[model samples]
Target: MKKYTCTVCGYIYNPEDGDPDNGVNPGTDFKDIPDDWVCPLCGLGKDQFEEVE
Candidate 1:
């Protein structure tokens, strides 16, 4: 799985270890995550994150 980073606060999202506290299960790809979900660390929207390519 790939990774994404919040451009606003540098909070990296790892698909291998999804945010449990936020209800995101592991193995969930970035594209599959809810668009309403925000960065757990920074409270920023999905639009604020960028794919780590």
Candidate 2:
């Protein structure tokens, strides 16, 4: 699974282990997530993320 990191908070977003606590289901692609979805840790916008793998 591809992973992304929040530039501000350093939070990792893994597609295989989605952030269910934030309404993200497992296997959910990063692109499939809502643009309104901000980082759970820092509340940064999607533009603040970058692929880590």
Candidate 3:
């Protein structure tokens, strides 16, 4: 799995790792973020996704 960082909030998206409701959910990766699922931190869209590596 890859690491995804929120460019707007610094929230890290870790699959099967971080918080479910607050952070990225298990099995669902960064690419799985829905169109309407805004970032809970900065409320930004997929445009704010940045590879953390």
Candidate 4:
């Protein structure tokens, strides 16, 4: 699973383990996250996230 890091707050979004806090089910891919989804930590937009190695 690819992971994305929030540039604003260092929050890591993992596709393999979806975020329950945001109502995201497990196994949901990063590309599948809703466009309105925001970083749980900082509430930043998806544009603030970047793919991680």
Candidate 5:
């Protein structure tokens, strides 16, 4: 699994913090993004996801 960061807010999409609403519990992979998902911190689209250093 890889890590992604929000360009607009620098919110790190850590796999350790999973999407509970979509049955994605902690430790889930980042590849399992929900279809209706948007950045909780910035409301940015998935297209805005970028690799974080």
Candidate 6:
């Protein structure tokens, strides 16, 4: 699985452990996240994130 990082707040999003607090279940992929999904820590939009190397 891949990981994504929020550019605005540096929030690391791990696909293996989705943000459950925001209703994202484990094993959820970055592409699978809803368009309206925002960063749990910063409330930033998906466009604010980039795939982590």
Q: lDDT tens digits, residues 1-53, model 3?
A: 67788888887777657447755567777777575666668877767878778
Residue-wise lDDT of candidate 4 within 1-53, one digit each (tens)?
Answer: 78999998899999888997788889988888998999999988899999999
- Return whichever of 2 and 5 wins on lDDT: 2
lDDT of each: 0.92, 0.90, 0.72, 0.90, 0.74, 0.93
- Alpha-carbon runs more than 4 Å astray in model 1: none
Candidate 2 local Cα displacement, residue 5, angstroms = 0.4
The Cα error of candidate 5 at residue 27, in Å, is 2.4
lDDT of candidate model 6 versus the reference: 0.93
Off by over 4 Å in 6: none
TM-score of each: 0.92, 0.89, 0.69, 0.90, 0.70, 0.93
Estimate, for each residue in 6-37, the C-alpha lDDT of model 6 and write its tens digit: 99998999999998988889999999999899
Candidate 4 error regions (>4 Å): none
Clashing pairs in 5: none
User: After best superposition, candidate 4 residue 21: deviation in angstroms?
Assistant: 2.0
Candidate 2 local lDDT, 1-53, one digit each (tens): 57999988899999999989888899998989989999999888889999996
Q: Report lDDT (Cα) of residue 47, candidate 1.
A: 98
Quote the RMSD, in angstroms, for model 2.
1.0
Ranking by lDDT: 6, 1, 4, 2, 5, 3
Clashes per model (N, Cα, C within 3 A): 0, 0, 0, 0, 0, 0
